[PDB]
């Protein structure tokens, strides 16, 4: 069950679900303490039960990686799904201040500058705040077993000033039998367009510190918050369900980079995705 | 599939399938666990072998009103951090500067001020940092189908100023059908010690927020990271799971209490405790 995990999920949200309104005001179906375990091995974890974007998650983590906050950044990249909130009229309506499109202390922030104070995008953080995102790195072959491999997107503090509160809050690794596994707690998903982005997001994050640390990949645990269908795209999901999916990619990096902040898309070779056509 | 049997399982898992490590002590472990615990008219304490019901609930006042303090819960003889906040073991890492009962910023600081400035017990940081705790007490009143209700002890600033890193990450509740529930991170947990111990831990906070606000207790969904089992106690442990548990106790609150730490050790009534007997 790699991938029958994720499409049961949202069943049981359907069947067992209760009735919760978003906060947007539109009226989702709910479930809590989803947990799928997802595999790394030989295999990657874009579903292909609905085509995935996998341009936006790569483009996406080596900017949560590089320490990266900015609407421009991506967009720049032609990947506008972060620009919604970058705005003059986004950000100033929503009261904020000064800068003309930050999106506070964002992801990616609190992975590499933790407990920084925030000034604004550009100035740059370097030996600023707690950099989580590889004190594992440095703990993974310090110390391979261990329960402190960590990257806490919450800090409460900084959240007043952050665009949205993460929506997955944070991942810890895990070192057995030279394998490296993941698991990401997501605290509210969406069925639909959330997760398995998340699902490919955190997937890719593994594969990454794989043959950085010379370990293989084991897996990948996407735990659940609130786990929730829009109630328009039922009859959209439904069929989406309907469908045989079909077999998982595999995941090649051609290049071997030694830092963590030096990869990019084209390091990213993908074998054989297939997804359905939407509608 | 439900409850301390579910605790079995990860139990029986481990034992078989889990990964021979050091830490040292060796031990076998498993990473990405969860599983769910009803707590509607029946509290999730286990009955395979007693957990400390004391140290439970008085912890947790003293979790709550935040206060870091071993000669607080040495006085009122449940002691499990006087290993901890004692000046034998403080004066070891470059606690040379610190007082004997003293701890840290650790749990109950951060739940009640948080990126606050760490001095010492003896001083009161009211007005001081920020709250997670009456500010998630006072959404659920609100807005209570948030899902950005969240509060998670991992703080990278105050880690090397606590005796230990947090072994229970986070939590994040929910609300629906007017029942409250609670997911609880641990990033470590003994399968025979600590874990049941922190299961009926947050059990009684999902408990006593339920009652503060008015709310039925739903469910109790246990998240684990890395899950292990010590070889002291590989053998003894599995006679413990040759054991059928006993059906849960209920818990009941006597005064009613409006306020969060006015609750004391005795508004706590537990019936129908019987759990299994050493060895």
């Known amino acids: 069950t790699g991938e ?10 359907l069947r067992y679900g209760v009735r919760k ?12 303490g989803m947990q799928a375990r997802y595999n790394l ?12 974007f996998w341009r936006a998650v790569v483009e996406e983590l080596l900017w949560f990686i590089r320490g990266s906050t900015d609407s421009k950044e991506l967009a720049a990249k032609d990947i506008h799904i972060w620009d919604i909130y970058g705005s003059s009229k986004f ?7 000064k800068r003309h499109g930050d999106l506070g202390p964002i992801y990616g922030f609190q992975w590499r500058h933790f407990g920084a104070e925030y000034k604004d995008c550009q100035s740059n953080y370097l030996q600023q705040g707690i950099d989580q ?3 594992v790195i440095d703990t993974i072959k ?4 261990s329960r402190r491999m960590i990257i806490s997107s919450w800090n409460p503090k900084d959240i007043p000033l952050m665009v949205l509160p993460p929506c997955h809050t944070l991942c810890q690794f895990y070192v057995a039998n030279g394998e490296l596994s993941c698991q990401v707690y997501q605290r509210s998903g969406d069925m639909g367009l959330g997760v398995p982005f998340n699902i490919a997001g955190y997937a890719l994050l593994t594969y990454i510190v794989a043959h950085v640390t010379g370990l293989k990949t084991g897996d990948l645990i996407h735990t659940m918050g609130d786990a929730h269908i ?4 039922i009859d959209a999901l439904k069929v989406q369900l309907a469908r045989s999916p079909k077999p998982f990619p595999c995941l090649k990096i051609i290049r ?4 963590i902040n030096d990869f990019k898309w084209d390091d990213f070779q993908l074998d054989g995705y297939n997804p359905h056509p939407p509608l």
Do not use: A
């Not at 009226?27 to 809590?32: A, H, N, P, V």
């Not at 071997?256 to 830092?259: C, K, L, P, R």
């Open 4 to 13: 029958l995990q994720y499409l049961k999920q949202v069943d049981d949200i």
């Open 21 to 32: 309104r978003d906060r947007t005001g539109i009226g989702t179906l709910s479930l809590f």
């Open 41 to 52: 091995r030989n295999e990657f974890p874009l579903l292909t039960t609905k085509r995935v």
């Open 91 to 97: 950000l100033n309506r929503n009261g904020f201040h």
């Open 133 to 135: 995102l590889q004190t």
């Open 142 to 145: 310090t110390n391979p077993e």
């Open 230 to 233: 829009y109630l328009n795209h």
């Open 256 to 259: 071997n980079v030694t830092d």
